[PDB]
Amino acid sequence: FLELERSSGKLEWSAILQKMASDLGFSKILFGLLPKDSQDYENAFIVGNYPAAWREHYDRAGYARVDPTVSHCTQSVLPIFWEPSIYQTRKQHEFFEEASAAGLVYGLTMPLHGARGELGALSFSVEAENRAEANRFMESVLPTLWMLKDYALQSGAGLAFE
Amino acid sequence: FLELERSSGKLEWSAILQKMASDLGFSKILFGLLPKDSQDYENAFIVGNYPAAWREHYDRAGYARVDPTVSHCTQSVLPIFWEPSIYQTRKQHEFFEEASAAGLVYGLTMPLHGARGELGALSFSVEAENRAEANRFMESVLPTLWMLKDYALQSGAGLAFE
Numbered sequence: 001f002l003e004l005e006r007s008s009g010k011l012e013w014s015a016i017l018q019k020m021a022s023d024l025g026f027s028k029i030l031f032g033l034l035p036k037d038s039q040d041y042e043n044a045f046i047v048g049n050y051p052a053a054w055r056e057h058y059d060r061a062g063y064a065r066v067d068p069t070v071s072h073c074t075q076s077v078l079p080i081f082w083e084p085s086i087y088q089t090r091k092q093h094e095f096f097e098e099a100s101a102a103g104l105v106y107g108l109t110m111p112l113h114g115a116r117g118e119l120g121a122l123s124f125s126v127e128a129e130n131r132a133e134a135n136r137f138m139e140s141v142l143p144t145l146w147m148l149k150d151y152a153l154q155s156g157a158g159l160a161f162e
Numbered sequence: 163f164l165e166l167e168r169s170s171g172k173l174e175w176s177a178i179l180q181k182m183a184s185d186l187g188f189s190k191i192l193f194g195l196l197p198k199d200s201q202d203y204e205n206a207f208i209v210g211n212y213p214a215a216w217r218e219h220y221d222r223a224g225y226a227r228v229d230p231t232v233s234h235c236t237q238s239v240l241p242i243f244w245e246p247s248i249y250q251t252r253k254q255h256e257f258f259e260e261a262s263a264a265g266l267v268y269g270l271t272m273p274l275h276g277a278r279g280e281l282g283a284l285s286f287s288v289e290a291e292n293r294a295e296a297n298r299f300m301e302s303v304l305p306t307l308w309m310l311k312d313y314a315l316q317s318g319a320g321l322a323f324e
């Protein structure tokens with residue numbers, strides 16, 4: 001964990017975080033953070049290895065308003081796993097359909113709530129045969145991810161905002 | 163963890179929170195929470211089994227402004243262990259002495275920061291022969307406490323502010 005705070009630049013920080021997650025079985029991650037009282041998702045500090053095309057489409061299509069993982073993070077500090085049942089509206093189902101196309105079917109999002117009011121999300125996406133297997137994979141490393149999201153929050157907020 | 167969300171009142175919640183911690187090896191705990199922008203450290207939402215005489219003395223002496231765990235919580239999301247070196251000022255050394263006499267020698271504080279901008283702390287105090295062994299035992303249950311502090315913050319801020 002230490003290496004995240006004693007890293008020095010965003011490039012290096014992002015690599016380390018990507019490697020920690022990868023080491024926990026996750027090939028794709030996203031770390032997004034907004035400062036206090038903000039809503040400018042355009043100017044949101046973003047880190048990880050989501051497909052670049054998905055990221056740009058996401059941002060263009062205003063999907064942050066449709067993404068149930070985002071609304072959830074505004075309302076809780078607890079993780080949300082990407083289950084069909086979180087995608088409820090037609091919009092959300094079509095978002096689900098596209099997101100699954102970019103290779104984001106299975107995963108979870110840890111809400112991020114910082115000391116200085118920072119708001120964010122750390123998502124981990126995993127590859128598996130089915131949901132039952134994906135969930136086993138995630139559940140096995142869940143207490144580590146839980147520590148990791150707070151470590152990432154503290155060090156990344158310092159990067160993004162100091 | 164669910165037993166915490168499935169409880170109805172502060173009475174029931176506090177009993178569950180205290181029993182979990184005890185089952186985990188911690189004889190004393192303190193769960194304190196404030197709403198957003200609050201500085202009312204004395205008139206806060208408090209739960210746990212610290213000695214009653216300690217709490218009364220603490221608040222009356224405005225110890226939340228001296229107690230290093232509280233100032234750390236304002237700035238971070240990461241745990242502060244109750245190490246000798248965190249008490250640096252003379253006022254903190256006199257605090258440390260008085261807390262040691264309440265039996266609060268070995269422990270850690272988890273900073274709490276909620277979705278609706280809640281501010282607080284969840285403390286766990288352990289009885290051990292020495293700081294070597296205490297840190298050892300706290301090390302070994304830290305991933306569980308890490309998950310637990312967020313489950314307690316999410317359900318806690320509910321009962322307190324709704």
Ligand SMILES: CCCCCCCCCCCC(=O)CC(=O)N[C@H]1CCOC1=O
Nearest residue numbers: 032033041044064073099104120121123
């Ligand atoms: C409350 C946090 C707001 C600040 C964070 C920056 C704003 C938008 C950043 C994108 C967040 C996501 O992209 C969430 C995610 O990982 N969704 C998964 C689920 C299925 O496919 C996906 O893309």
Ligand SMILES: CCCCCCCCCCCC(=O)CC(=O)N[C@H]1CCOC1=O
Nearest residue numbers: 194195203206226235261266282283285
């Ligand atoms: C950012 C938090 C401010 C609001 C939370 C409630 C208000 C203050 C309540 C008292 C907090 C403590 O009591 C902290 C603690 O655990 N101190 C240990 C360390 C050695 O002796 C102790 O008593």
